[PDB]
Design an enzyme around this catalytic site. Structure first.
Site, mmCIF file in Angstrom:
data_model
loop_
_atom_site.group_PDB
_atom_site.id
_atom_site.type_symbol
_atom_site.label_atom_id
_atom_site.label_comp_id
_atom_site.label_asym_id
_atom_site.label_seq_id
_atom_site.Cartn_x
_atom_site.Cartn_y
_atom_site.Cartn_z
ATOM 1 N N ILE A 186 5.186 -14.161 8.339
ATOM 2 C CA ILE A 186 6.211 -13.382 9.135
ATOM 3 C C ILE A 186 5.746 -13.123 10.477
ATOM 4 O O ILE A 186 4.727 -12.369 10.851
ATOM 5 C CB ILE A 186 6.908 -12.088 8.599
ATOM 6 C CG1 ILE A 186 7.449 -12.428 7.150
ATOM 7 C CG2 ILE A 186 8.020 -11.765 9.397
ATOM 8 C CD1 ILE A 186 8.427 -13.514 7.207
ATOM 9 N N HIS A 193 0.772 -1.273 -0.029
ATOM 10 C CA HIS A 193 -0.092 -0.123 0.081
ATOM 11 C C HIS A 193 0.660 1.252 0.079
ATOM 12 O O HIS A 193 0.183 2.455 -0.253
ATOM 13 C CB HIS A 193 -1.012 0.050 1.160
ATOM 14 C CG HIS A 193 -0.569 0.192 2.469
ATOM 15 N ND1 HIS A 193 -1.254 0.171 3.773
ATOM 16 C CD2 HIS A 193 0.995 0.126 2.985
ATOM 17 C CE1 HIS A 193 -0.382 0.503 4.504
ATOM 18 N NE2 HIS A 193 0.783 0.679 4.184
ATOM 19 N N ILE A 226 -4.166 -4.699 1.647
ATOM 20 C CA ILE A 226 -4.519 -6.164 1.877
ATOM 21 C C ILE A 226 -5.976 -6.049 2.396
ATOM 22 O O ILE A 226 -6.601 -6.981 2.600
ATOM 23 C CB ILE A 226 -3.558 -7.245 2.556
ATOM 24 C CG1 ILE A 226 -3.093 -6.540 3.861
ATOM 25 C CG2 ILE A 226 -2.536 -7.285 1.497
ATOM 26 C CD1 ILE A 226 -2.286 -7.656 4.641
ATOM 27 N N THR A 273 17.557 3.654 25.250
ATOM 28 C CA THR A 273 16.348 3.792 26.164
ATOM 29 C C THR A 273 16.768 3.212 27.703
ATOM 30 O O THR A 273 16.188 3.767 28.699
ATOM 31 C CB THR A 273 15.241 2.677 25.526
ATOM 32 O OG1 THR A 273 15.746 1.623 25.251
ATOM 33 C CG2 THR A 273 14.617 3.420 24.377
ATOM 34 N N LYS A 279 8.462 -10.409 19.537
ATOM 35 C CA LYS A 279 7.573 -9.810 20.677
ATOM 36 C C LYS A 279 5.917 -10.456 20.762
ATOM 37 O O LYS A 279 5.378 -9.746 21.451
ATOM 38 C CB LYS A 279 7.400 -8.327 20.118
ATOM 39 C CG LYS A 279 8.857 -7.532 19.662
ATOM 40 C CD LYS A 279 8.575 -5.833 19.842
ATOM 41 C CE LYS A 279 9.810 -5.196 19.382
ATOM 42 N NZ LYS A 279 11.095 -5.838 19.724
HETATM 43 N N1 LIG Z 1 12.257 -5.577 11.134
HETATM 44 C C1 LIG Z 1 12.480 -6.505 11.955
HETATM 45 O O1 LIG Z 1 13.611 -6.381 12.876
HETATM 46 C C2 LIG Z 1 11.825 -7.625 12.144
HETATM 47 C C3 LIG Z 1 12.073 -8.705 12.703
HETATM 48 C C4 LIG Z 1 11.015 -9.907 12.936
HETATM 49 C C5 LIG Z 1 9.937 -9.714 12.295
HETATM 50 N N2 LIG Z 1 9.532 -8.542 11.795
HETATM 51 C C6 LIG Z 1 7.967 -8.440 11.483
HETATM 52 O O2 LIG Z 1 7.990 -8.478 10.062
HETATM 53 C C7 LIG Z 1 6.710 -7.488 9.632
HETATM 54 C C8 LIG Z 1 7.276 -6.541 8.513
HETATM 55 O O3 LIG Z 1 8.363 -5.835 9.281
HETATM 56 P P1 LIG Z 1 9.518 -4.787 8.515
HETATM 57 O O4 LIG Z 1 10.570 -4.458 9.116
HETATM 58 O O5 LIG Z 1 9.674 -5.434 7.013
HETATM 59 O O6 LIG Z 1 8.546 -3.506 8.339
HETATM 60 P P2 LIG Z 1 8.078 -2.433 7.125
HETATM 61 O O7 LIG Z 1 7.189 -1.584 7.338
HETATM 62 O O8 LIG Z 1 9.428 -2.050 6.625
HETATM 63 O O9 LIG Z 1 7.504 -3.323 5.964
HETATM 64 C C9 LIG Z 1 6.171 -3.730 6.016
HETATM 65 C C10 LIG Z 1 5.701 -3.591 4.502
HETATM 66 O O10 LIG Z 1 4.266 -3.684 4.578
HETATM 67 C C11 LIG Z 1 3.641 -2.501 3.781
HETATM 68 N N3 LIG Z 1 2.145 -2.715 4.466
HETATM 69 C C12 LIG Z 1 1.691 -2.468 5.660
HETATM 70 N N4 LIG Z 1 0.525 -2.567 5.733
HETATM 71 C C13 LIG Z 1 -0.100 -2.979 4.561
HETATM 72 C C14 LIG Z 1 -1.360 -3.074 3.905
HETATM 73 N N5 LIG Z 1 -2.519 -3.085 4.827
HETATM 74 N N6 LIG Z 1 -1.303 -3.679 2.674
HETATM 75 C C15 LIG Z 1 -0.324 -3.442 2.200
HETATM 76 N N7 LIG Z 1 0.848 -3.488 2.424
HETATM 77 C C16 LIG Z 1 0.883 -3.160 3.726
HETATM 78 C C17 LIG Z 1 4.224 -1.237 4.204
HETATM 79 O O11 LIG Z 1 4.217 -0.379 3.322
HETATM 80 C C18 LIG Z 1 5.713 -1.874 4.178
HETATM 81 O O12 LIG Z 1 6.342 -1.509 2.737
HETATM 82 C C19 LIG Z 1 6.208 -6.966 10.960
HETATM 83 O O13 LIG Z 1 5.216 -7.754 11.399
HETATM 84 C C20 LIG Z 1 7.381 -7.156 12.016
HETATM 85 O O14 LIG Z 1 7.166 -7.142 13.342
HETATM 86 C C21 LIG Z 1 10.284 -7.499 11.522
HETATM 87 O O1 LIG Z 2 16.568 5.751 20.009
HETATM 88 C C1 LIG Z 2 16.839 4.368 20.138
HETATM 89 C C2 LIG Z 2 15.887 3.445 19.443
HETATM 90 C C3 LIG Z 2 15.836 2.191 19.853
HETATM 91 N N1 LIG Z 2 16.601 2.013 21.008
HETATM 92 C C4 LIG Z 2 16.556 0.556 21.537
HETATM 93 O O2 LIG Z 2 17.181 -0.452 20.499
HETATM 94 C C5 LIG Z 2 16.838 -1.445 20.539
HETATM 95 C C6 LIG Z 2 15.880 -1.900 19.124
HETATM 96 O O3 LIG Z 2 14.850 -0.838 18.754
HETATM 97 P P1 LIG Z 2 14.272 -1.045 17.243
HETATM 98 O O4 LIG Z 2 13.616 0.358 17.237
HETATM 99 O O5 LIG Z 2 15.456 -1.048 16.385
HETATM 100 O O6 LIG Z 2 13.631 -2.197 17.302
HETATM 101 P P2 LIG Z 2 12.140 -3.051 18.275
HETATM 102 O O7 LIG Z 2 13.057 -3.913 19.116
HETATM 103 O O8 LIG Z 2 11.507 -1.896 18.950
HETATM 104 O O9 LIG Z 2 11.572 -3.634 17.174
HETATM 105 C C7 LIG Z 2 15.327 -1.593 21.577
HETATM 106 O O10 LIG Z 2 15.980 -2.385 22.756
HETATM 107 C C8 LIG Z 2 15.120 -0.397 21.527
HETATM 108 O O11 LIG Z 2 14.636 0.198 23.053
HETATM 109 C C9 LIG Z 2 17.223 2.783 21.704
HETATM 110 O O12 LIG Z 2 17.912 2.374 22.599
HETATM 111 N N2 LIG Z 2 17.450 4.089 21.396
#
Ligand SMILES: NC(=O)c1ccc[n+]([C@@H]2O[C@H](COP(=O)([O-])OP(=O)(O)OC[C@H]3O[C@@H](n4cnc5c(N)ncnc54)[C@H](O)[C@@H]3O)[C@@H](O)[C@H]2O)c1
Ligand SMILES: O=c1ccn([C@@H]2O[C@H](COP(=O)(O)OP(=O)(O)O)[C@@H](O)[C@H]2O)c(=O)[nH]1
Ligand SMILES: NC(=O)c1ccc[n+]([C@@H]2O[C@H](COP(=O)([O-])OP(=O)(O)OC[C@H]3O[C@@H](n4cnc5c(N)ncnc54)[C@H](O)[C@@H]3O)[C@@H](O)[C@H]2O)c1
Ligand SMILES: O=c1ccn([C@@H]2O[C@H](COP(=O)(O)OP(=O)(O)O)[C@@H](O)[C@H]2O)c(=O)[nH]1
Ligand code: NA
Ligand code: NA
Ligand code: NA
Ligand code: NA
Ligand code: NA
Ligand code: NA
Ligand code: NA
Ligand code: NA
Lengths: 339, 340
Positions: free
Chosen positions: B146, B57, B83, B211, B150
């Site tokens: 995915i 989106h 979606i 933090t 958390k």
């Molecule tokens: N980034 C990480 O460290 C990490 C680690 C493990 C799991 N995840 C999980 O993976 C998922 C994605 O994380 P990310 O880091 O890629 O985030 P992100 O925001 O970079 O990517 C999410 C994508 O989905 C799209 N999107 C969101 N809602 C939508 C909708 N309704 N329809 C279509 N597109 C939509 C967004 O525009 C974006 O491009 C989250 O659930 C997150 O918690 C992330």
């Molecule tokens: O300005 C910041 C942003 C994040 N964090 C810490 O860095 C870790 C990762 O934060 P991030 O936003 O990357 O991802 P999150 O774990 O919230 O998905 C967490 O323990 C945050 O509390 C931090 O100390 N300072």
């Protein structure tokens, strides 16, 4: 930078007028984390708004503008929301009661909107309808919509959708609900635009891809365009279609050659790739010889006539169920010449 | 570089397994332009998918991944769509008939989801329901979601929503529609994450904001996490909740200090700003002593029980209208301890 060269440097920026307009208002910006929306947010803080409500459906964009404005966190509220969700949007307007909406949420990429015309219609036209309707219902005093030069005699789905948004919003304007639309051309270095594309090609030792050797666009710095939009909003009495003076246009080939010169990479080729579906070689010049002047040399008022909303609402219903969006848009915008 | 130092370097990446799973498939990736989604797209191309449908989106994100993959333009389709739009999503699925959906679309920022719990519910839970329901109705063979650490014993709205998404998708799995969820922890350098924030603070000569001095996270490179997700999808028979081995966690203070050292900064302070609402000092370790092994030392299978879908669907209807989202989530996820 290339940006410095192509700035408009308007002589008629007026900080005190914008400050008088925005001081102590609750302002809601849709598309708050976008190229235009983010600058609107920044100028709302600069020029004295009391409370900024930032609406965006993209979490990273919202995160980023909220972080950018962290020094002002007590006066800003990040609302993670699509303007298509009327019920939630209505609750937001009731809760915060903005007096001004600045509407900068839309899909803008011409190729993607050619490939996804239903989503362009939904996000741009229906989103605008929902937001404008909710604004007027919730007694928002003033509504300013960002428009674009591609809305003038459009040749692509994107630009045509924005023209429908102009017709809708302006036709909603009345004595209690003042609407202005402001048309301008390309903002230097906006999201997904040519300048960042060419920078990435150069950094990756790739030839620059130029659509056509003669293509031109009009350009302004985002801070210039946004402040002029706010000036126009300040002077609007409702129902105005404003147009900005963009200065001279810029041949994209000259832009490409200048970026190669600035990067000292004149060993790179400029490769011609072709005009894309719906793309114009020259966007329309915004200011017409019969447009009305304002007190700012950079801002003019273009003619517009309201349409009957009973008609336009029906046609907007049609756009959502029709088998041919291009033909359905032509029924609303008879000057649409879809390339 | 800091990312190099924190890479997992799993010993059990298996390119030929992923190729065998993906070759000549029609694959749709939701959230295709995101941090995880974009890497999924890149790996789908690398490992031989016939046609990649990219759904996002966010127009810039979609534009960017479509551009990144321009050498493969003839086998990719950019679909600018939420979606949540069931009618348009059904049209896409009926038209392109993907065999595999990789679901990476969600809202993930804990603070923004604390501030916007209704949008977290809608985008995460209702979005997942709509996409999963459409996938099953359109005879998609396999659906891989995915998930995140958390979601385990969640303390924030974000994580709790993802827990509900696990419950829903796994409960939809059957003999004809194989669902897997994969949990992992933080991806190094993801959108809006701590490493980019620290890099920007250092580049702008600002104190680093930490933090809490004791906070830790588990980290993996995005390419490592995504390949393991695909290996998990490949071996899945339906109904599995997989968990990745993230290695040792990393104290964020050590991350901050290392970044300062890598740029020879001894002019910058580290300022302690405090634990935020719903934030954990230590995310849960993903691998339980009773999780089942797989053939990959990096991938385990956690226990999960199906829930009654008629009940869960009623709860999801309620979540959309209720005034008390935190309380309503607790009724679905009894292990939710909202760190208010
Ligand atoms: N980034 C990480 O460290 C990490 C680690 C493990 C799991 N995840 C999980 O993976 C998922 C994605 O994380 P990310 O880091 O890629 O985030 P992100 O925001 O970079 O990517 C999410 C994508 O989905 C799209 N999107 C969101 N809602 C939508 C909708 N309704 N329809 C279509 N597109 C939509 C967004 O525009 C974006 O491009 C989250 O659930 C997150 O918690 C992330
Ligand atoms: O300005 C910041 C942003 C994040 N964090 C810490 O860095 C870790 C990762 O934060 P991030 O936003 O990357 O991802 P999150 O774990 O919230 O998905 C967490 O323990 C945050 O509390 C931090 O100390 N300072
Ligand atoms: N960039 C330019 O050069 C330029 C020039 C003139 C006019 N405009 C117009 O201004 C508008 C925005 O352009 P931009 O360059 O800022 O684009 P952008 O994509 O950078 O910004 C738009 C913002 O709106 C958000 N958004 C989109 N649909 C939404 C929805 N349904 N609900 C909530 N948020 C939504 C996006 O996530 C994004 O942050 C477009 O109509 C465009 O044609 C742009
Ligand atoms: O790779 C590119 C991208 C864009 N353009 C041209 O640069 C101008 C600005 O394109 P951009 O995408 O920035 O904005 P648009 O005018 O389409 O909104 C247009 O004339 C494009 O045809 C180009 O020559 N090569
Ligand atoms: Na003045
Ligand atoms: Na910026
Ligand atoms: Na900043
Ligand atoms: Na705030
Ligand atoms: Na009428
Ligand atoms: Na192998
Ligand atoms: Na990238
Ligand atoms: Na393509």
């Amino acid at each position: 930078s290339i940006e410095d060269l192509l700035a408009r440097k308007p002589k008629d920026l007026d900080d005190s007028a914008v400050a008088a307009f925005l001081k102590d208002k609750v302002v809601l910006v849709s598309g708050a984390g976008g190229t235009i929306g983010s600058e609107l947010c920044k100028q709302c803080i600069k020029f004295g708004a009391k409370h900024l409500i930032m609406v965006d459906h993209s979490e990273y964009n919202l995160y980023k503008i909220n972080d950018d404005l962290n020094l002002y966190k007590e006066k800003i509220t990040p609302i993670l929301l699509s303007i298509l969700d009327k019920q939630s949007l209505d609750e937001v307007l009731k809760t915060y009661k903005p007096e001004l909406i600045l509407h900068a949420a839309a899909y803008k990429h011409v190729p993607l909107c050619e490939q996804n015309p239903h989503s362009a219609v939904i996000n741009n036209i229906l989103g605008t309808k929902i937001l404008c309707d909710s604004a007027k219902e919730n007694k928002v005093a003033k509504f300013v919509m960002i428009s674009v030069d591609k809305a003038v005699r459009p040749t692509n789905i994107m630009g045509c959708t924005k023209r429908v948004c102009e017709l809708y919003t302006l036709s909603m304007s009345d004595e209690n609900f003042e609407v202005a639309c402001v048309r301008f051309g390309n903002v230097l270095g906006s999201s997904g635009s040519v300048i960042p594309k060419f920078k990435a090609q150069i950094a990756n030792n790739e030839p620059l891809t130029l659509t056509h050797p003669d293509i031109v666009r009009y350009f302004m710095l985002v801070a210039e365009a946004v402040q002029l939009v706010l000036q126009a909003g300040a002077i609007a009495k409702g129902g105005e279609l404003f147009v900005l003076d963009m200065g001279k246009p810029v041949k994209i080939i000259d832009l490409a050659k200048k970026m190669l010169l600035l990067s000292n990479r004149n060993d790179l080729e400029i490769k011609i790739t072709g005009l894309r579906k719906g793309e114009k070689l020259y966007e329309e010049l915004l200011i017409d010889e019969n447009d009305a002047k304002t007190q700012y040399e950079s801002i003019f008022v273009a003619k517009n006539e309201k349409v009957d909303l009973d008609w336009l609402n029906k046609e907007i219903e049609n756009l959502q169920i029709c088998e041919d969006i291009s033909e359905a848009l032509l029924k609303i915008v008879p000057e649409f010449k879809h390339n």
